[PDB]
Each structure stands twice: as C-alpha cells, then as structure tokens.
Amino acid sequence: YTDFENTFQKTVEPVYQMHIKTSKDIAVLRSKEWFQLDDEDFDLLNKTLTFETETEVTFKNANIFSSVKCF
Amino acid sequence: PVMADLNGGLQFVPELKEFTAKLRKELVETSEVRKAVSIETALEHKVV
Amino acid sequence: IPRETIPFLHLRKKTPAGDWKYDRQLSSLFLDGLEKAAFNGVTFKDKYV
C-alpha cells in the first residue's frame, strides 16, 4: 500500500516529567514555542512539571510526515 | 613614607565583592543559557 | 555623653567608604551595659568560653 494521503496515526504519548532545578531549564523551556503557560509570569523554579501529550500525524510517505500535531 | 593609591577609584564602589559576583553570574548565566538554547534549537531542527 | 566628645570607651561603625568611626548609638548601648553591669552585675550562666 502506497496511498499515504489516506493514512494517519494518533498516539497517546507516555507522561513525561521534568524537575525544573535551575533558571537554565526555565530558559530552555521558554525557548520552545510549543511550551505555552496560561500565566506567563508562573514561577517554574523547583517545580515538577508533567506533560500529557497526544501526537496526531499524517504521512507524505513511509518516513516523512506531512503534518505533526503534539498537544 | 609615601602612600600611593593606584586603585582606579575602585574603593568608591560599595559592596564590591557582591557587585563582582553579580557581574560574574549575569555573564556565566547568559553563556550557559545561550549554550543550552542553541544546542536544543539545533536538536529540534535535526529532528524536524 | 557631651555632644562632640568621644568617650574613652566606645564602639565604631564602618562607614560606606570602609572607615571605622565613633558611633554614638552603638557606644551608648555599650556604655549603658557597662553601667548596668557596675550596679546590678551581669550573668554569664550557660556561656561556654
């Protein structure tokens, strides 16, 4: 089968945990556009964050995705 | 005896040690953040 | 303590310039303690020296 326009994949990702220990970790997270706090002035230092993501993918071919959603 | 102050006004900077430790952190923090953010931006670009 | 007289015993305070100068308030604390010591005595109970 080579009909990649009809394919799609939804994955429930494993829950990822980050312990934010330093202000470097905070800066590295704020550098990511996808990281979107409700309150931008939220204090991340010494906090444990959990990311509960789902990935929706559509294929162009076997190896390359035509679209990626992670939310 | 002669006492020559060749100190370049340094004595008039109050709380000098703290002032030097703050300039050091402001520099090391900026260095380490830029290193980490550039390494992650390269790895993101690599993945995509 | 007269105005513009430095007591024979006094405390000094470090100025923002980093010089140690007579301080009337600290000196008043020290001298009042000495006066109380001289009338009432002072205890050192539970000091390890």
Secondary structure elements and pairings:
The structure is cut from a larger assembly and holds one copy of chain A (71 residues) and two copies of chain B.
Chain A: E1 9-12, E2 16-19, H1 23-30, E3 48-51, E4 54-59, E5 65-70
Antiparallel strand pairs in A: 1-4, 2-3, 4-5
Chain B: H1 16-47
Please characterize this protein's 3D structure.
This is part of a larger assembly, with 1 copy of chain A (71 residues) and 2 copies of chain B. Chain A has 71 residues and is mainly beta. Chain A has one domain (1-71): Beta Barrel (Lipocalin). Chain A has 1 helix and 5 strands, in the order ββαβββ. Chain A is elongated and about 50 Å long. By secondary structure, chain B is mainly α. Chain B contains 1 helix and no strands. The termini of chain B are far apart. The A-B interface holds A 23-24, 27-28, 31-32 and B 29, 32-33, 36-37, 40-41, 44.
